[PDB]
């Protein structure tokens, strides 16, 4: 887990294969075992003595033959051209002499071949280790077979012995065979500037301004002197939201199934190369030995990408314009940047081999510099290779961008630079591109709904043939675009799943980044304004400088707001791409209808609530264009159902309800008050006989709950009046005076239920009179208000042991009336004081 | 001193070496987060004290040209970031406050001659969920502990004890006590739950720029408050990051999952229930199974109580008013 994603895990690394030759299987071919999350290595069940038959042997092999292979850095240090005057001190007297001795010394490398390899391969000292008195002890029980099969007995088996261990990598040049036949075709220190590049991850408010830190390194560049251009001669279409790129396209393990890989990105030219040496078909050998040689290859590949984008958008995705091609070019440029910096969040067959070869290139060339593994300075060599690659891309990007523009065409009159989009995390760039696609398709699907389905010439008019022919069919096209899974009407973008599902995955990932990037330890400069803030590093060089990595970007992206993809997207999107209906990404429309048709949350159309009235709440990804909930699917909303979006008087109660509903009933047995969101159990099994009836107890509880809640509610909307005071042509024609006229209706229902309940005590108190059992509304409401006092002004109602407040009584009788059996009015007056606005009347002034 | 008195409130009431300690530590976490929000200006309460404290803190950290956003940022990074320099380690104001909390707990534990709990030993305290969400978790935890308390009371006292209810722990007059406690505690909790759920439904998955108040709730993705609390109350309370648990609440005495939809049709929408915590609506409307066993006699004895207590109220109004009638 310490290793970063680019660190190229298990580096057993032949081109999508190895010493146990395989095809594309998984990211053992060729990186990131920590995310692979299984153990892909068996060098460990390699027994510890076979891992000393590796540690003595293969560890020798790699690191110490590397001491004479690659830590024998090269023989390029002759230093012949230039004469030297002063040196200050001489330390390399033994360096080169013991470097040539370092393969000719009888006392360090012949006393590392026929003395130390007497412990490795030519074992003269511990000859083919036989028995140890001052030598290795083995635990033979699992390593005994090695003695016979390698040391001092028969040694003939499959590649089960040799071939998988690194065997011949050290100048093995046996030439005992001659081949006369020809199987050949036709023959054939550093500078370090730092900057403050102003990213514009926006066009709108953006509380604070962005400024990322990048490291130019002019010594890593061509030399100078811009534009020059002439050379030539160098179809997917499905966002692959899939993942773990098993071996085909897809997203890294950590972004798997989470953001979707644009077809443009999976089709870009560089990503379709397993080499940079393959950049030109004509040339068939290594080409990159200098910084300018390496740069020219990137120039070629960028130019060819520009050529491809021209061949694709103008005019096959472009309408003779330039904005579309320009946006695609910007995105491809940023993807090139990520792909060479190694921070890309996607994969295919050629990536993870391109990255290997790219590490080798950025290795040799430019490598020298990098070395300050511990560092100490900051002009200084780039600490780790990855930062060196980042600096190489932060410089040298000008040349790539101009190459891209040349590859397209523009270059003077159709270009009129360096867009800063390459400084935005690839996740956010993918999110923006995917959303722009969705908004394009949505705009297409909404144009015709707006033209047709506005009631007759506006969304609100006579319903007379709302569907002038079938405008509901246009609304249904829009529904099948939003809800279906790509085959029954769904568009390009999502891959087999509804937009709601894909958006949910995007939100999960975005918030994952937000939480991680500031519950972090190391990040960039803040301007504290947000939630999940505890990490050690929030760094900078100058004032207000973010550290340019993903967490720092999500630190500056948070902390100005933008904690959710909705808000970030409303900030960055152009203006009006979402469609003719002015649907903002920040508003949340909770739509609810027949379960998403093709891929199903546990049903289609009959199992649950979501089956037929599907509750899901995205931004205006909604199944109607943000205002045509009623314009589609005809006649305009009634005054009553304009409460359900005005939403100051919500839906909890039904039959006896501040809350706009009912269930009946109209008989003796048994009209009842129902709560919305819970179902009364009409089972009379709850009860017993000859007492309060089975339905009577559930009624009494529902009624007393109604009483208390609706009294609280009417006080909230009357004294507070939801604002004071008091409280269309106002808010008090619709949504008010609309439930007041409901309360009367359903206090009447509740008055009917309770006078008829005392009449079910003509069914129950004729059994139990006169306790009257249950007491009438007057007396019960009296008791209810008195309990309301005794409970929360008298330290728990059970303090009713002593009732006297001794001067509260005047207030209490004023609020609650005297002489109980008079408590009908304690509620009726609150309805006769459900007035003074409706009343209304006049009003006074 | 707040931590000291808070520990004194929780721990000596029940000597469970973990349960009391873990509950006290969760309460102290909540109090510390509330203190942090008072400093940062995010607090939802402007009472007689915090209103003036908030205004004058705006004065202290403000200036002539500083707007509200700048002032809030100044308070936030004065608290969170190490705006204090000391001869000791790089302690930030948050760390100093938490260390003070720990010292108060140590004082209380020393006085009781107990052992300093392992929780409260954590040096770094995680992020604070938004104040409303923290209060929602507190409400749920308190509701569930008091629900188990009151329902076990009514179970073993009013509705038939293990000893033939007619000859049970009730003479039909103290069973009234248990049912009274349950019904009276339940009633306000229903209104409170309705209010909190209605606020959650308009607050979840909102950034700073979208939420009605300036604070962000991006971290809370859950369609309904019940689903959120299902994710949250899923575990057993420990002291860190899980300050609530809900066992056997609502209707049945098992945990997640008693009946999964994995075997019929994916998925199971809880998630995860801790009792089909949709039962929160049923339990607050007294439609759960557990109460339905007790519904009958609870209601009838409630009516008897209403009748007699009303025969008392009618003669007490006339008692102490003494102007209208008898007594």
């Amino acid at each position: 887990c310490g290793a970063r994603s680019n660190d190229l895990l298990i580096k057993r690394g032949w081109r999508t294969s190895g010493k146990s030759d395989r095809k594309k299987n998984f990211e053992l071919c060729r990186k990131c075992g920590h995310y692979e999350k299984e153990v892909p290595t068996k060098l460990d069940y390699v027994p510890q003595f076979l891992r000393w038959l590796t540690e003595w042997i293969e560890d020798f092999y790699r690191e110490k033959q590397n001491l004479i292979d690659d830590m024998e850095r090269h023989r390029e240090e002759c230093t012949r051209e230039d004469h030297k005057s002063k040196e200050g001190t001489s330390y390399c007297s033994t360096c080169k002499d013991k470097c040539k001795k370092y393969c000719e010394c009888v006392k360090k490398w012949k006393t590392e071949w026929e003395n130390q390899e007497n412990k490795y391969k030519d074992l003269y000292e511990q000859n083919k280790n036989k028995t140890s008195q001052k030598n290795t002890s083995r635990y033979d029980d699992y390593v005994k077979d090695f003695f016979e099969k390698l040391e001092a007995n028969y040694s003939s088996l499959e590649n089960y012995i040799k071939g998988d261990p690194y065997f011949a990598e050290y100048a093995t040049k046996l030439s005992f065979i001659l081949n006369p036949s020809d199987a050949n075709n036709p023959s054939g220190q550093d500078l370090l500037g730092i900057l403050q590049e102003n990213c514009s991850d926006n066009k709108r408010g953006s509380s604070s301004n962005d400024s990322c830190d990048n490291k130019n390194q002019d010594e890593c560049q061509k030399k100078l002197e811009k534009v020059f251009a002439s050379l030539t001669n160098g179809s997917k279409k499905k966002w692959i939201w899939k993942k773990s790129s098993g071996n085909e396209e897809g997203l890294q393990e950590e972004y798997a199934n989470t953001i979707g890989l644009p077809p443009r990105t999976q089709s870009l030219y560089l990503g379709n190369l397993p080499k940079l040496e393959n950049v030109c078909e004509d040339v068939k050998d290594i080409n990159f030995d200098t910084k300018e040689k390496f740069l020219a290859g990137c120039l070629i590949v960028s130019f060819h990408e520009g050529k491809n984008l021209k061949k694709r958008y103008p005019q096959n995705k472009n309408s003779g314009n330039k904005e579309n091609l320009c946006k695609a070019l910007e995105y491809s440029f940023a993807d090139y940047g990520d792909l060479i910096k190694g921070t890309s969040i996607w994969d295919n067959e050629y990536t993870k081999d391109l990255e290997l070869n790219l590490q080798n290139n950025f290795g040799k060339l430019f490598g020298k510099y990098i070395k300050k593994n511990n560092t100490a300075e900051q002009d200084t060599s780039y600490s780790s290779l990855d930062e060196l690659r980042e600096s190489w891309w932060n410089t040298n990007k000008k040349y790539i961008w101009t190459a891209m523009k040349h590859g397209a065409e523009m270059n003077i009159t159709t270009c009129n630079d360096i867009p800063t989009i390459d400084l935005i995390p690839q996740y956010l760039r993918f999110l923006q591109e995917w959303v722009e696609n969705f908004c394009e398709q949505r705009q297409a699907k909404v144009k015709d709904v707006i033209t047709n389905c506005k009631s007759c010439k506006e969304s609100g008019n006579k319903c007379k043939t709302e569907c002038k022919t079938k405008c509901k069919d246009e609304c249904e096209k829009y529904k099948k675009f939003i809800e279906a899974c790509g085959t029954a009407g769904g568009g390009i973008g999502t891959a087999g799943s509804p937009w709601s599902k894909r958006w949910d995955q995007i939100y999960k990932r975005y918030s994952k980044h937000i939480e991680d990037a500031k519950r972090n330890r190391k990040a960039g400069t803040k301007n504290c304004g947000t939630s999940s803030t505890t990490n050690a590093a929030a760094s900078t060089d100058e004032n207000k400088c973010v550290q340019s990595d993903i967490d720092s970007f999500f630190k500056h992206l948070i902390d100005i707001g933008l904690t959710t993809p909705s808000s970030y997207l409303s900030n960055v999107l152009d203006d009006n791409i979402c469609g003719a209906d002015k649907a903002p990404w920040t508003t949340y429309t909770t739509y609810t209808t027949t379960e998403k048709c093709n891929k199903e949350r546990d049903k289609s159309k009959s199992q649950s609530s979501d089956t037929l009235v599907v509750v899901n709440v995205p931004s205006p990804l909604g199944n109607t264009p943000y205002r045509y909930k009623y314009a589609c699917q005809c006649k305009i909303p009634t005054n009553e159902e304009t409460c359900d979006d005005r939403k100051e008087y919500m839906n909890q109660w039904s039959c006896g309800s501040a809350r706009t509903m009912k269930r009946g009933y109209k008989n003796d047995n048994y009209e009842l008050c129902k709560y919305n969101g819970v179902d009364v159990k009409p089972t009379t099994v709850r009860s017993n006989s000859s007492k309060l009836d089975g339905n009577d107890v559930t009624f009494f509880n529902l009624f007393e709950q109604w009483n208390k809640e609706i009294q609280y509610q009417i006080e909230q909307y009357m004294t507070n009046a939801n604002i004071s005071c008091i409280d269309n042509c106002k808010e008090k024609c619709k949504c008010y005076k609309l439930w007041i006229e409901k309360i009367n209706d359903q206090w009447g229902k509740q008055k009917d239920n309770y006078n008829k309940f005392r009449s079910k005590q003509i069914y129950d108190a004729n059994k139990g009179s006169q306790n009257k059992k249950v007491v009438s509304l007057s007396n019960f409401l009296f008791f209810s208000c008195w309990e309301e006092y005794i409970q929360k002004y008298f330290n728990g109602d059970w303090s009713k042991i002593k009732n006297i407040g001794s001067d509260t009584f005047e207030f209490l009788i004023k609020k609650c009336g005297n002489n109980s059996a008079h408590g009908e009015e304690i509620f009726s007056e609150k309805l006769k004081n459900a007035e003074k606005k409706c009343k209304e009347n006049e009003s006074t002034d | 001193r707040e931590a000291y008195y808070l520990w004194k409130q929780y721990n000596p009431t029940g000597k469970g070496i973990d349960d009391a300690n873990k509950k006290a530590c969760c309460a102290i976490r909540g109090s510390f987060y509330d203190l942090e929000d008072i400093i940062k200006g995010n607090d939802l309460v402007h009472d007689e004290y915090t209103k003036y404290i908030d205004s004058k803190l705006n004065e202290i950290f403000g200036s002539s040209n500083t707007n509200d956003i700048d002032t809030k940022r100044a308070r936030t990074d004065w608290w969170e970031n190490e705006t204090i320099t000391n001869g000791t380690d790089r302690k930030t104001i948050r760390q100093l406050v938490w260390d003070a909390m720990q010292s108060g707990v140590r004082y209380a534990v020393e006085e009781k001659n107990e052992n300093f709990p392992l929780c409260m030993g954590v040096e770094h305290i995680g992020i604070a969920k938004p104040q409303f969400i923290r209060w929602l978790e507190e409400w749920t935890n308190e509701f569930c502990e008091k629900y188990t308390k009151y329902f076990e009371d009514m179970k073993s006292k009013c509705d038939p004890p293990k000893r033939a209810d007619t000859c049970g722990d009730n003479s039909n007059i103290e069973c009234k006590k248990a049912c009274a406690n349950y019904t009276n505690w339940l009633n306000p909790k229903r209104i409170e739950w309705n209010g909190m759920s209605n606020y959650y439904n308009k607050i979840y998955r909102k950034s700073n720029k979208e939420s009605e108040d300036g604070k962000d709730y991006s971290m809370i993705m859950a369609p309904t408050v019940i689903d959120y609390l299902n994710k949250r109350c899923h575990g057993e309370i420990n002291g860190n990051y899980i300050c609530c648990s809900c066992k056997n609440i609502g209707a049945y005495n098992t945990t997640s999952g008693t009946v999964n939809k994995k075997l019929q049709k994916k998925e199971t929408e809880c998630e995860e229930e801790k009792g089909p915590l949709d039962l929160m609506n049923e339990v607050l409307n007294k439609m759960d199974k557990k109460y339905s066993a007790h519904k009958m006699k609870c209601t009838e004895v409630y009516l008897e109580h209403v009748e007699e207590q009303l025969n008392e109220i009618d003669n007490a109004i006339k008692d102490y008013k003494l102007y209208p009638l008898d007594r």
Partner: antibody, heavy 122, light 107 residues
Framework: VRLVEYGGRVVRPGGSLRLSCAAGGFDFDDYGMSWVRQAPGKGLEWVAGINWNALDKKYADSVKGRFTISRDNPKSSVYLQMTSLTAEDTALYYC????????????????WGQGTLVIVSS | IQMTQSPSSLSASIGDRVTITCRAS??????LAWYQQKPGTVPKLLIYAASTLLSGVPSRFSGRQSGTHFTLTISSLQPEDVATYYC?????????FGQGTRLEIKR
């Protein structure tokens, strides 16, 4: 759909004045508002803008510090408090709404009020 | 942020094509709206998003954009189109209006 302003008055130079703007069938709770002034026989000039939740208030560079904008959603009003008025602030002041509900102070002003004269002189 | 609108007194006759330019100093990519004001009335928003014609506006208006050059085009000038046009940008901070172009009948 219906915006009316109040407070148009003749004020002494350097004085103060509070303009108000109502709202009609318009759902004045998630739409940004703006104040735009037009001096007599001149071009319009943006003056102030306030977000939907009043967490984002922006001002023109000239009228900054001297002008304050505020909402009151339950009363469905938006107010502009003006102080240190100069002789140059004499203008017809309109209150306008975004035509798009959003999270920003500034936007396309779709519906405008009749405006109030704020003649400033001695 | 300034919004240089020119010409300031464009003249034309009924039936002509009228073009108004609203150069923006910074990048506002398409957060620009066009306003028409007849004498003695409130302004009326014609175009927003720099191209999207507002509903009810006669279709003879159009708006297009090239970089930071925004142009409002009246294809067939009508006697009820004689007014001032303002091209207010609304991207972020000062949302400032244009200078104002006043059309007049050419005789």
């Amino acid at each position: 759909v219906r915006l009316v302003e109040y407070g148009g008055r003749v004020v002494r130079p350097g004085g103060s004045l509070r303009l108000s703007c109502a709202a009609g069938g318009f759902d004045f709770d998630d739409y940004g508002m703006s104040w735009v002034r037009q001096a007599p026989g001149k071009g319009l000039e943006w003056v102030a803008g306030i977000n939907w939740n009043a967490l984002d208030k922006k001002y023109a560079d000239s009228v900054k510090g001297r002008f304050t904008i505020s909402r009151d959603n339950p009363k469905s009003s938006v107010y502009l408090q003006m102080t240190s008025l100069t002789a140059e602030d004499t203008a017809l002041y309109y209150c306008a709404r975004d035509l798009r509900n959003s999270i920003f102070a500034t936007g396309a002003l779709g519906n405008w009020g009749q405006g109030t004269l704020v003649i400033v002189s001695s | 942020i300034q919004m240089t609108q020119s010409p300031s007194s464009l003249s034309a006759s009924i039936g002509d094509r009228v073009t108004i330019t609203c150069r923006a100093s910074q990048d506002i990519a398409n957060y620009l709206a066009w306003y028409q004001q007849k004498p003695g009335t409130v302004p009326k928003l014609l175009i927003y998003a720099a191209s999207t014609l507002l509903s009810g506006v006669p279709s003879r208006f159009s708006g297009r954009q090239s970089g930071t050059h925004f142009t409002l085009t009246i294809s067939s000038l009508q006697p009820e189109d004689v007014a001032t046009y303002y091209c207010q940008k609304y991207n972020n901070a000062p949302a400032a209006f244009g200078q104002g172009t006043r059309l007049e009948i050419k005789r």
